[PDB]
Amino acid sequence: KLPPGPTPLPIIGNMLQIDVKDICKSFTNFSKVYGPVFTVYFGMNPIVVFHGYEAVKEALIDNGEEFSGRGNSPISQRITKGLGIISSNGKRWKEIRRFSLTTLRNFGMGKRSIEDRVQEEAHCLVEELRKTKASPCDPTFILGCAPCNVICSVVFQKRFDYKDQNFLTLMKRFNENFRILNSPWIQVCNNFPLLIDCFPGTHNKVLKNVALTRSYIREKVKEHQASLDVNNPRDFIDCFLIKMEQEKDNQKSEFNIENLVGTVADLFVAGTETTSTTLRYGLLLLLKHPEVTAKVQEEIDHVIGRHRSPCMQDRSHMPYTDAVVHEIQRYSDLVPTGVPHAVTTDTKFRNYLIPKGTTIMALLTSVLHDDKEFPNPNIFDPGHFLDKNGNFKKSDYFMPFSAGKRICAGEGLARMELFLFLTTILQNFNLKSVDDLKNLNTTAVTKGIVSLPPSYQICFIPV
Ligand code: HEM
Ligand SMILES: CC1=C(/C=C/C(C)=C\C=C\C(C)=C\C(=O)O)C(C)(C)CCC1
Ligand SMILES: CC1=C(/C=C/C(C)=C\C=C\C(C)=C\C(=O)O)C(C)(C)CCC1
Ligand SMILES: CCCCCCCCCCCCCCCC(=O)O
């Protein structure tokens, strides 16, 4: 028996009872009436939601093996075709995600570490902010390049010149497609496929952007295979090709070109817009909270100094800054409803039974905003991650990357980009607003699977 929930309508389920513009608002509201676990229907499809740390943990963690599946929706099926790591299941997923995790270790890609590739970008990042000559600007674009280049640097040999036209279009397609798919419309179309016909232009655009993007990713593999030296890998591509060669004999090996071009793409899409969005939400919060930013700058000066680039080792000596990066992710609440899962088999969740294949949703927001774990969860405060003596306080409720067997595969890289970008920037700059900080609103604009910070201007004044 499925978890109780609003009784649905004959064809559209509870659709005309949910705010497609702000789903969490609708879900939280259902929890006040149905409790921690409940069922809602998007059209014909049943979806069971988990609200609050207890339900979310029990699902993703305790009953982790059951809730580690990807549902495979209509839109989803014509893009990734089940290829890769974000949209794959079973044997193929376990093998691509184990390899990926292994090669995304700081030193899993040959001699140059991931950390070195990220520091180089942070430098180029501050270098671009210099070119704004301290005038007011919207950091969306420059701030969106760095995280893109990081991936480029991780899957290809060298990074791109910010002005390298080949980099720019390779960035717009991913952005363009990201904008398209982070619309409340993908929900409607995903549960009512027929509606997709009403959007030929949009549908054609996505397809084209995916063709060009994959097409370019396949070229970079051509080149890589003609210069491969199995002894010294250069990036994610080499590490994959080497693995391929080692599996060349068993013809049912998941390590084939298709999963490669697919996995690389998964890295871009899951790794660009996300950290890029968290960074942008971060500078805004530091721009609005000068008291927090000075304290951070005081740790940089003391531990890192002003001549050398910061590095991950500096975090263990900077509990305040770390707490600021942790509170930036909690507050920004990038992915409130979390990404949907599907159960691998008939599953008994405490008192109920969830049939295999059913779509599941663990509301990360409900954890990131638990008002017992983070007193006054609606206010930005590094203190939520600091104890009485100013030491870093970790929380089991810190799930901006989700939890369980499907936790973000590049969590290590997300945090490295956040730490090294924010501290490098705050070491060479101070944040000035063109107007009183009081005017500055921090309320996210939630209109899709991914929340964005409100638009804003910011002046990067060199210290
Ligand atoms: C601050 C930035 C980021 C945040 C908040 C974030 C968050 C998440 C979340 C919420 C998920 C879904 C977990 C689930 O299915 O339950 C996820 C998945 C994933 N992330 Fe990230 N992510 C970020 C950046 C990165 C980066 C930089 C990469 C790549 C190098 C990446 C790689 C992926 C991949 C491949 C998955 C799918 C994993 C799977 O289904 O097995 N992410 N991340
Ligand atoms: C990984 C990931 C993302 C992208 C998802 C992609 C490319 C496919 C999802 C397919 C699903 C969720 C299929 C299903 O189960 O029906 C977004 C950028 C939103 C946010 C951060 C984590
Ligand atoms: C499409 C899609 C979704 C949204 C993902 C987002 C926000 C961006 C995707 C970008 C891609 C798929 C880019 C590319 O590969 O070019 C969700 C998870 C709600 C459900 C399954 C279908
Ligand atoms: C200031 C400009 C006002 C004009 C507002 C026009 C609003 C209509 C928008 C229609 C969008 C439909 C897009 C369909 C795209 C497709 O073919 O898939």
Instruction: Report the amino acid identity of residue 337.
Output: T
Does ligand 2 lie within 6 Å of residue 340's CB atom? Answer: yes
Structure-token pair, residue 230: 């199995």
Please report, in range form, the residues annotated as the binding site for substrate: 73, 177, 214
DSSP, res 427: H
- Residue by residue, DSSP assigns 315-382 as GGG-HHHHHHHHHHHHHH-SSTT---EE-SS-EEETTEEE-TT-EEEE-HHHHHT-TTTSSSTTS--G
By DSSP bridging, strand 429-432 and strand 458-462 are antiparallel
Q: What is the gyration radius of the CA atoms in the chain, in angstroms?
A: 22
Q: How far, in Å, from the CA of 10 to the mean position of ligand 1?
A: 36
H/E stretch holding 429: strand 429-432
Taking the CA of 419 as reference, the closest ligand is 1
Q: Which residues of 81-114 are buried (b: 16+ CB within 10 A; e: fewer)?
A: ebbbbbbbeeebbebbbebbeebbeeebbeeeeb
By DSSP bridging, strand 352-354 and strand 347-349 are antiparallel
d(CA 86, CA 395): 26
Structure-token pair, residue 232: 């010294």
d(CA 29, CA 23): 10
329 neighbors 400 (Cβ within 8 angstroms): yes
DSSP, res 383: G
Identify which of 48, 76, 343, 344 to mutate to test ligand 2's pocket (most ligand atoms within 8 A of the CB): 76
Taking the CA of 417 as reference, the closest ligand is 1
283 neighbors 139 (Cβ within 8 angstroms): yes
d(CA 441, CA 284): 9
Please report, in range form, the residues annotated as the binding site for heme: 408
C-alpha of 382 from chain center: 21
* Dihedral-angle region of residue 134 (phi above 0 means left; psi in -120 to 50 means alpha; beta otherwise): left
Query: What are the backbone angles phi and psi of residue 393, rounded to the nearest 5°?
Result: -115, 115
- The owner of tokens 């390590």 is 255
191 neighbors 42 (Cβ within 8 angstroms): yes
d(CA 93, CA 226): 28
DSSP, res 62: I
d(CA 22, CA 32): 16
Residue 313 Cα distances to 317, 375, 462, angstroms: 8, 30, 25
Residue 399 Cα distances to 368, 383, 408, angstroms: 7, 17, 10
Residue whose CA lies nearest to ligand 2 atom number 22: 270
**Rounded to a whole number, what is the distance in angstroms from the first to the last CA of the chain?**
62
Task: Give the technique used to solve this structure.
Answer: X-ray
Structure-token pair, residue 217: 């990713």
The CATH number of the domain holding residue 274 is 1.10.630.10
Residue range of the domain that includes 183 = 1-463
Instruction: Give the residue among 311, 360, 396 at the shortest CA–CA distance from 60.
Output: 360
Q: How far, in Å, from the CA of 130 to the mean position of ligand 4?
A: 38
Please report, in range form, the residues annotated as the binding site: 73, 177, 214, 408
Starting from the edge strand earliest in sequence, which strands make up the sheet with 45-50, in order?
37-42, 45-50, 359-362, 341-342
Taking the CA of 278 as reference, the closest ligand is 1
Helix orientation angle between 257-271 and 236-247, rounded to the nearest 10 degrees: 150
Residue whose CA lies nearest to ligand 1 atom number 10: 401
| Number of separate domains in the chain | 1
Resolution, angstroms, 1 dp: 2.6
454 neighbors 444 (Cβ within 8 angstroms): yes
Q: Which residues contact 315 (CB under 8 A, 6 or more apart)?
A: 321, 322, 419
For the chain, give percent helix, strand, coil, nearest 5: 50, 10, 40
Q: Which residues of 133-142 are buried (b: 16+ CB within 10 A; e: fewer)?
A: eeeebebeeb
Residue whose CA lies nearest to ligand 4 atom number 13: 199
By DSSP bridging, strand 45-50 and strand 359-362 are parallel
Structure-token pair, residue 119: 């520091």
Identify which of 86, 186, 204, 451 to mutate to test ligand 3's pocket (most ligand atoms within 8 A of the CB): 186
Cα angle 391, 101, 308 (rounded to 5 degrees) comes to 50
Question: Residue 348: how many CA atoms within 13 Å on its side-chain side?
Answer: 2
- The owner of tokens 């939400």 is 281
The SS3 of residue 171 is helix
Residue whose CA lies nearest to ligand 1 atom number 43: 408
Q: Which residues contact 157 (CB under 8 A, 6 or more apart)?
A: 224, 234, 235
Residue positions counted in the chain: 463
- Residue by residue, DSSP assigns 105-145 as STTSSSSS-HHHHHHHHHHHHHHHHHTTTT-EE-THHHHHH
| Count of other CB atoms within 10 angstroms of residue 210 | 17
Residue 83 Cα distances to 24, 79, 225, angstroms: 30, 9, 20
d(CA 213, CA 222): 15
